[PDB]
Amino acid sequence: ATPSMMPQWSYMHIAGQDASEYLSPGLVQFARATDTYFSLGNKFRNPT
């Protein structure tokens, strides 16, 4: 409802950063190490 909706998109990744660049740098290390057995990659909203 703002005339430039960049913060409201980038807060919830309508249009923000990619799914591997905003996270804390341990969690990208965690989610790729636990790739086969405990996959948590479907909870982080890769935007297009």
Binding site: G16, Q17, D18, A19, E21, N46, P47, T48
Partner: peptide
């Protein structure tokens, strides 16, 4: 760079593989 043409997944543009530039479709190839 031509980064303003690719449909970006997020901030990184979607740049394809290197076999997506030619073709070698012959009968038995």
């Amino acid at each position: 760079n031509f980064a303003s043409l690719a449909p970006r997944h997020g901030s990184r543009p979607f740049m394809g593989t290197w076999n997506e530039i030619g073709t070698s479709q012959l009968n038995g190839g």
